[PDB]
Design a protein around this ligand. Structure first.
Ligand SMILES: CS[C@H](CCCc1c(N)nc(N)[nH]c1=O)c1ccc(C(=O)N[C@@H](CCC(=O)O)C(=O)O)cc1
Length: 205
């Protein structure tokens, strides 16, 4: 499966994703990284790895649909099968999300449905949970909604700061984002017609 990663900044987890695709039995290749912001660190990561990049500036389009249609056209040109979001900071239009339904994935540094929105590590610490984690899900129109693919629990440790908890969750993300991509790329996990996750036994052995 040919994979695009959409970014707005540092492309957190992009290197984890790249490294995974270069493993022997990978079902995925990262074929393009698209940013809506020029000269961000995640583009340099992609470029250093020899992956094509594009920059699409939302300010050049009259509205969100026209902007997302420009993104889609690049994805079309590059024959992309699967999209991963890695810190993409523009809300994608209903028509875009619908088109890419069941083929676009993203990650959030909580055990959803807890700690929706920004600053989930601070939310966890403020709340005083002893277990948090990260969640990879299919992207839906509503932020943080969308069917869950994988989750991994991560402990909160007495004395943790936002920084120390964040690095522990990031280590889990580095594991589960590529694991989830491989599940979706191999076809092992697919989104059912009923809108629920389907774990598929594949014909080819
Ligand atoms: C990286 S945190 C999260 C990412 C949500 C992934 C997502 C997404 N990008 N689009 C849809 N429809 N559904 C989604 O789940 C998020 C939550 C909110 C925003 C948001 O309000 N963005 C604003 C402007 C943000 C900016 O670029 O400054 C907007 O697009 O108008 C952007 C991103």
């Amino acid at each position: 499966a040919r994979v695009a990663v959409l970014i707005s900044g540092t492309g957190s987890n992009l290197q984890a994703l790249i490294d995974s695709t270069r493993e022997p039995n990978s079902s995925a290749q990262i074929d393009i990284v698209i940013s809506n912001k020029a000269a961000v660190a995640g583009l340099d990561k992609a470029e250093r790895a020899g992956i094509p990049t594009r920059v699409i500036n939302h300010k050049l389009y009259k509205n969100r649909v026209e902007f997302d249609s420009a993104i889609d056209l690049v994805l079309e040109e590059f024959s992309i099968d699967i999209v991963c979001l890695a810190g993409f900071m523009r809300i994608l239009s209903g028509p875009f999300v619908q088109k890419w339904n069941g083929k676009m994935l993203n990650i959030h540094p909580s055990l959803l449905p807890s700690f929706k929105g920004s600053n989930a590590h601070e939310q966890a610490l403020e709340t005083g949970v002893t277990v948090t984690g990260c969640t990879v899900h299919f992207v839906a129109e509503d932020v943080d909604a969308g069917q869950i693919i994988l989750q991994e629990a991560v402990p909160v440790k007495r004395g943790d700061t936002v920084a120390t908890l964040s690095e522990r969750v990031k280590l889990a993300e580095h594991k589960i984002f590529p694991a989830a991509l491989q599940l979706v790329a191999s076809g092992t996990v697919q989104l059912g017609e009923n809108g629920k996750i389907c774990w598929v036994k594949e014909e080819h052995h």
